Paper text:
Potassium‐coupled chloride transporters (KCCs) play crucial roles in regulating cell volume and intracellular chloride concentration. They are characteristically inhibited under isotonic conditions via phospho‐regulatory sites located within the cytoplasmic termini. Decreased inhibitory phosphorylation in response to hypotonic cell swelling stimulates transport activity, and dysfunction of this regulatory process has been associated with various human diseases. Here, we present cryo‐EM structures of human KCC3b and KCC1, revealing structural determinants for phospho‐regulation in both N‐ and C‐termini.
Due to preferred orientation of particles for KCC3, the map resolution for KCC3b‐WT was limited to 3.64 Å. While this structure was obtained under K+‐free conditions, we see the same configuration of the N‐terminus in a lower resolution structure of KCC3b‐PM in presence of K+. By contrast, the maps of KCC3b‐WT, determined at 3.64 and 4.5 Å in detergent and MSP nanodiscs, do not show any electron density for the N‐terminal portion. On the other hand, there is no density for the N‐terminal helix in the cryo‐EM maps of KCC3b‐WT in both detergent (B) and nanodisc (C) environments. Because we see density for the N‐terminal segment only in the KCC3b‐PM mutant and not in the wild‐type KCC3b structure, we suspected that this configuration could be stabilized by a conformation of the CTD that brings the β5/α5 and β7/α6 loops into close proximity of the N‐terminus.
Numbering used by the authors:
A (entry chain B), B (entry chain A): 128 to 253, 259 to 895, 900 to 928, 1028 to 1094
Write the structure that this text describes.
């Protein structure tokens, strides 16, 4: 079944996008824009608009290539690629866009019918306000006719979309053929003009002051329109009429006439000034204000023209509105859409110059076909007659109204059916065939509200603002998801670079703000509220709570993004696991551990406090909760910011061995284990106490985590007291110098150890080390003095450990904190007593020792 | 030492804030603003500005009360309360504010000296541009004089701050005394006025056309300024002079004169229009343009006046610029600041009305004291003479320039010394006494750049924009931190409600945008870039990487915020721990477990995959890494989004018992354990396999987590196949109905089980349950059909289990998935074989069973 609807890029995405870009503006307003802007600035307008739409086409193609393309419309693709939040924001902004587009197209069909086809038939008789009322009443009647048609029989609309496109394309080819024929044989459309004041020709017949009748020089009607005598019997004619001259100016000069040089400059005359051709002669007298003087119909400006013109390039999201019936979506969609935009941009940029170079510089600024005997201005450039265009534009515009009144409610019911936003659930209701019955009424209501502003020139900025907001979000989600390395964002496109999407976002964000700085802020705040509300509803949906669940989702997303990345880090920073030992009273046997951990991390970073409770889990559940509360209160008391984890284990050694390798969620692991020294290991008769510490040392070294064994921790300073002056005597014995040097710094960054100095008692070869140590300190911009002491089984170890004792006390007996590198545990577990004796003698005579062992790739 | 500087709220925060709010604007521009705006709109201006500054005072007091107040300036308080990011953004915005304030005050001192004190002495001779050049050259000389003074001898500035405040206050009291005296005896300052055209009086002497000299009616000088004869010998006088009349209008009418009714309306005349008193008579002839006509000096508007006036209310952050020397900061600072703002607001609102009701409606719009013989306009309202004000304002304004050139570089070196932003490190360099030597040069450079725009009227909007951005960030950080329940945000204030800070943020965000929509966007983007760069640098500082560390910090902060909250949730949602069993080959023995977990959670939520590796950790480190990679590849293959944790344990039972209670970081815990059924427990000779499952059941029940034992999992559908039609036969046997009912729904929300139906085979009492079940389904808006089957040691259990088998197969033999409530494990571990036999018979004849046991507070 799918294969038959399979369509090549052309018939699948080119024609829908081509049929939806070609709107009414190209006819009813391109000539006016060219005239009041000058070909140069008109070129700037068309190019800037086409640039936003092209960069946005590139971003949307990047979205199209990423991942499998869902079978729904463009909304489903955008949703599945940018998350439901962006999906809903773009859905609603594009939907309001489509509704106000149905409003503009209905206004256009009414304007064409009323001004050009049948002027005589009007609700309000002959003045501007009357047109507005005529448009309001005529607009709603057509609006009601459109709603009823779309409600009953959309299949007929599907059938005649092709005829509508036919009408559009025939009209454009007629325009081009007329422009070409205007080189040798241009048409005979003349305009009466009085001096440099252009006259209307709806009522005048001859551009002559006196129309000879039956061999009698009776004054012509124009005399009757500038002089009230009408018989030239001592007629009182006004100043400008008597002074200046009426002339018949060829309204469409040849393509070779060279008028482009004349109309190459802006006019921008404000409301009610008479349109003046700055070529013909003129007197200077003034005061004779008359009705016949063609007037500037709106106080124009550049920023107004860009807004009036932008809704003619919107519609590229329709390229992928037929994405279910495609063969190679990620291959057909980008090329088809970009080619469609290139074609339409080529048409606009060619027609701008052709109008500039073929139509008089006065007939262009005429926004209602006056002075050309009431014919469509662009219609005058056509091969058969202006009638072909005046009817083709009307049929195309009513067809586009039907198209957008079928396309908007389907999108609304799809956004409702997705249950992204709850309150729109009412509009999810569908007809027997799945047509949105109760959404359509809302679309009609909003289109009604639009039509009430019965002027294209005032509806166009609103439509443009909504579509511009849609494009801005579509560009921003891609730029963001590319920068932040969002999961599942693989934009498999040969030309998509995040700078492109960012440049598009910036350009037509500027466009938004240019057109209106207050509508743009209103749109941005509406979109932000919808976005945050969708995020909140999703949180409440998945986690169960609003703000609790919001933070929960934030954490999960951060950890996932954190998972798909390089394991190492360019710098090494100690993330602690504090091993608190719980006594038989279930009280922390060493709070100084937490005090010191707090001082070491200085309240920032990750600190996981782990502890083992000896016993059976089946019956110590309550004790585990109580002891967890105890440790949490202790953490809060020592200003430790972090998390607590208790394991009720059968064996203390096994509990710690499981904590050391299972703590932390993946990606938020610790990398150092901070332990308390087993004070009084020899004193206790039981050998388990000292053997457990060794077991932990082996487990820590094997897991490749750093180890900081703090000894004599009962004498460690509390968070409230301070040191006036003291020396952190780092002993860089042998290797593992990175952690040893880095530690004291981190300690000195805290207020307790802030006021102390640092002395590295490194142990000719040392002098080689002296130069390296000096470089390390010179770079770190820290006040540190390095002194190099030249330094050169069990009996030998003791005989040398006593020398180490001698030197360390002789240099550092009165130090406030002695860091000290550690030796590894024995391979054979028999020599553990000898190993602990080595440590005890090595650390004898020291008030505060922090034994440190690297065992890792520390840099 | 601290006690002596202890100052009560008045002398500690009132006088610094009072001395820093009273600027130059109050003199040189309040009269002009009142005149060109009308007392009404001037009142609107003063009230709106004072409203932003008052709500911001409330927010800053809320900041002041929260936590301990650091000893530094306001920057340190703001930093320690809003994080270094907001601290740095506000610091730089307020610093640029202070520099451009030094620029405005130097411009003001020059303007006062040059226009009012010594007009004759000017660099450029007599025209507007000449004043600008005079101001540029004069400004830099004073600027260089100020820099040298501040560089050498700030102690003298500290000494004379009191004299500067004295000058300000004496001036304001002189203004009020003059206003009062103007009730009975107003002063004699007359103005010559020709018709309704006001004349300048710098050069005229008598307001008379002819000045009689020596009994001869020679024409007066004004004749020479409107007629070139100067001898009235057939003098050719212009039109307006001959038609209209010169009159002497009292320039300061009495307070009782009632002119307020006259000057109660806006003027807003654009540049160069002659200032006209709309009271006196006038002819209508025009054309006689003359030099003497006093002209509107700037194309005024409301939005311009608000910008010109705002830099007179800035300075409230100086209230807490002396926070180290206070007694009760959180008590003195709020009251002192708010009282200071009330005092100054009271002064402005009184002087607006007094000027409205005492000065002619023409002398006010005169921005350079013309027509009053070149005297300060407000100076004319004073008891002794205008000289007292003209000198007091000059001394006050040079004093404020010195004050802001000492206050800006100190703040800059403090922001540098904090090492928040790296590249500013160069400016951290200080003098011997700690004065910023190399920061001051930059402050002077920026002040120089400001002075180059030699006009207060153009510097004031920039200053106002910077201070407005500072206040907006100070309000937004408080509103945000109050809403999101940010840790350590305890605003102990009796009147602070987040709606107040939000209203302040909105009001003067509107102020920002009103004054300039392009400067405001430039300021916002600058602040956003500084904020994100500070955040990035902090990330790189603490975690070691830029983007890795950024996501790491985001995760830690989310979990912490997640920690201080209610433990339960209004809704229950299953967060899974999938227990994968690793075989002797270290391969996942049941991938269907992951398949089903993926289907159950549907890719959203938290899924922690735990598994135990039997062995010793010291030597299976490599195996643990390999098996972790294996399980990660498996997770990615089954579209499971989540984390993996392996524990190398000595006993499989103990490894699982430790995983069940230690998985997840605090706050991101699981709440359900998903296990695979021990298929073939009887077949295996070893009893360990079945006994371990029971051990896990007891541990799961005791930990109060839900349990989902999936049986016959080898037949569970894969993620690619689907079910055309089928029945999820939920058996709500007895209790724990919330989880049982909730599960199938979550399953049906996935595409695999999307196309299946649901049948609840609940087991008169049931009919009571029928009504409850119907209500539960009616609310959930899900298509579900409920059928109620009426239903009524070891031998009895088997004799009834076979009945359960009979019924369940008779109803559901051909079901696609049979959910089934579970019975608890025996209390005595001897009956475990009987317990497992009960389960096996109860589940006999079923292709797919999901045994479910609640054991928790599920709602
Ligand atoms: C149609 O003819 C009228 C009749 O003069 C044109 O009006 C006048 O055009 C001049 C341009 O030369 C405008 O500027 C004037 O320029 C002279 C040059 O010296 C200067 O002396 C004047 O003071 C003035 O600036 C003038 O404002 C304008 N109106 C009047 C009342 O003179 C009109 O511009 C012609 N149409 C077009 C499209 O040019
Ligand atoms: C100072 O005196 C001059 C001399 O007339 C005033 O100029 C003229 O004031 C009138 C206000 O009445 C302006 O509006 C005119 O109103 C009449 C009312 O019918 C209307 O017929 C006119 O068409 C016009 O709209 C007028 O524009 C203005 N200028 C001229 C050239 O007449 C001037 O307003 C006086 N100063 C003040 C502060 O009022
Ligand atoms: C009107 O026409 C006459 C003769 O055709 C010519 O001399 C005159 O200059 C024209 N008027 C103007 C304003 O050029
Ligand atoms: C000028 O003064 C004369 C007499 O003092 C008076 O009649 C005339 O109305 C005055 N001019 C105007 C414009 O009122």
């Amino acid at each position: 079944p799918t294969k038959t609807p399979q369509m090549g890029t052309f018939m699948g995405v080119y024609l829908p996008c081509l049929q939806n870009i070609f709107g009414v503006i190209l006819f009813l307003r391109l000539t006016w824009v060219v005239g009041t802007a000058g070909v140069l600035q008109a070129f700037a307008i068309v190019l800037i608009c086409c640039c936003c739409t092209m960069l946005t086409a590139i971003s949307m193609s990047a979205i199209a290539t990423n991942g499998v393309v869902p079978a729904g419309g463009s909304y489903f693709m955008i949703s599945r690629a940018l998350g439901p939040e962006f999906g809903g924001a773009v859905g609603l902004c594009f939907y309001l866009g489509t509704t106000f587009a149905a409003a503009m197209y209905i206004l256009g069909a009414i304007e064409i019918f009323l001004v050009y086809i049948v002027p005589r038939a009007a609700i309000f008789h002959s003045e501007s306000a009357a047109m507005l009322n005529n448009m309001r009443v005529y607009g709603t009647a057509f609006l009601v006719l459109m709603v009823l048609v779309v409600f009953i029989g959309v299949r007929y609309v599907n059938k005649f979309a092709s005829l509508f496109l036919a009408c559009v394309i025939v009209s454009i080819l007629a325009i081009y053929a007329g422009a070409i024929k205007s080189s040798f044989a241009p048409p005979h459309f003349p305009v009466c003009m009085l001096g440099n004041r252009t006259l209307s020709s709806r009522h005048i017949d001859v551009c002559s002051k006196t129309k000879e009748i039956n061999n009698m020089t009776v004054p012509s009607k124009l005399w009757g329109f500038f002089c009230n005598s009408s018989q030239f019997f001592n007629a009182t004619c006004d100043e400008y009429f008597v002074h200046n001259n009426v002339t018949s100016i060829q309204g469409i000069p040849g393509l070779a006439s060279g008028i482009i040089t004349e109309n190459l400059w802006s006019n921008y005359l404000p409301k009610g000034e008479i349109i003046e051709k700055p070529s013909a002669k003129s007197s200077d007298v003034l005061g004779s204000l008359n009705h016949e003087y063609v007037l500037v119909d709106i106080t124009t400006s550049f920023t107004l023209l860009v807004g009036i013109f932008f809704p003619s390039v919107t519609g590229i999201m329709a390229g992928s509105n037929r994405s279910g019936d495609l063969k190679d979506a990620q291959k057909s969609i980008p090329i088809g859409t970009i080619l469609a935009i290139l074609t339409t941009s080529f048409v606009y940029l060619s027609n701008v110059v052709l109008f500039g170079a073929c139509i008089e510089g006065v007939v262009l600024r005429d926004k209602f076909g006056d002075a050309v005997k009431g014919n469509l201005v662009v219609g005058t450039l056509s091969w058969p007659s202006p009638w072909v265009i005046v009817i083709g534009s009307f049929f195309s515009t009513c067809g586009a109204g039907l198209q957008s009144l079928t396309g908007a409610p389907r999108l609304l019911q799809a956004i409702a059916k997705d249950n992204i936003i709850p309150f729109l659930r009412v509009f999810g209701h569908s007809k027997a065939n799945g047509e949105p019955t109760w959404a359509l009424l809302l679309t009609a209501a909003i289109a009604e509200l639009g039509i009430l502003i019965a002027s294209l020139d005032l509806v166009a900025p609103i439509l443009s603002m909504f579509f511009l907001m849609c494009y801005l979000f579509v560009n921003l989600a891609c730029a963001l998801q590319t920068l932040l390395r969002t999961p599942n964002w693989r934009p498999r496109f040969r030309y998509y670079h995040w700078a492109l999407s960012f440049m598009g976002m910036s350009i037509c964000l500027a466009l938004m703000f240019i057109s209106s700085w207050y509508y743009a802020i209103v749109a941005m705040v509406i979109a932000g509220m919808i976005y945050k509300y969708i995020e909140y509803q999703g949180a409440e949906k998945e986690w169960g709570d609003g703000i609790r669940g919001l933070s929960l989702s934030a954490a999960r997303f951060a950890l996932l993004r954190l998972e798909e990345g390089p394991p190492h880090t360019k710098n090494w920073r100690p993330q602690l696991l504090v091993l608190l030992k719980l006594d038989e009273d279930l009280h922390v046997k060493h709070p100084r551990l937490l005090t010191f951990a707090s001082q070491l991390k200085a309240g920032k970073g990750l600190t996981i406090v782990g502890s083992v409770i000896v016993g059976n889990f089946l019956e110590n559940y309550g004790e585990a909760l109580a002891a967890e509360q105890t440790i949490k209160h202790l953490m809060e008391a020592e200003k430790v910011k972090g998390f607590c984890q208790l394991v009720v284990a059968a064996k203390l050694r096994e509990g710690i061995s499981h904590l050391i390798q299972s703590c932390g969620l993946g990606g938020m692991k610790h990398n150092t284990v901070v332990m308390g020294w087993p004070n009084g290991w020899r004193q206790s008769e039981d050998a388990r106490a000292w053997k457990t510490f060794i077991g932990t040392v082996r487990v820590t070294t094997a897991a490749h985590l750093a180890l900081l064994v703090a000894k004599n921790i009962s004498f460690f300073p509390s968070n409230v007291e301070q040191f006036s002056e003291g020396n952190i005597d780092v002993w860089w014995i042998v290797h593992d110098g990175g952690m040893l040097m880095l530690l004291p710094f981190l300690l000195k960054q805290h207020k307790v150890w802030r006021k102390c100095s640092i002395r590295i008692f490194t142990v000719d070869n040392s002098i080689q080390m002296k130069k390296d140590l000096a470089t390390f300190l010179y770079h770190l911009r820290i006040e540190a003095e390095v002194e190099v002491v030249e330094m050169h089984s069990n009996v030998r170890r003791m005989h040398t450990a006593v020398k180490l004792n001698e030197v360390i006390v002789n240099k550092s007996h009165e130090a406030k904190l002695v860091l000290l590198n550690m030796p590894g545990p024995p391979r054979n577990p028999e020599g553990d007593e000898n190993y602990m004796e080595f440590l005890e003698v090595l650390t004898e005579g020291l008030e505060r020792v922090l034994l440190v062992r690297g065992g890792g790739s520390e840099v």
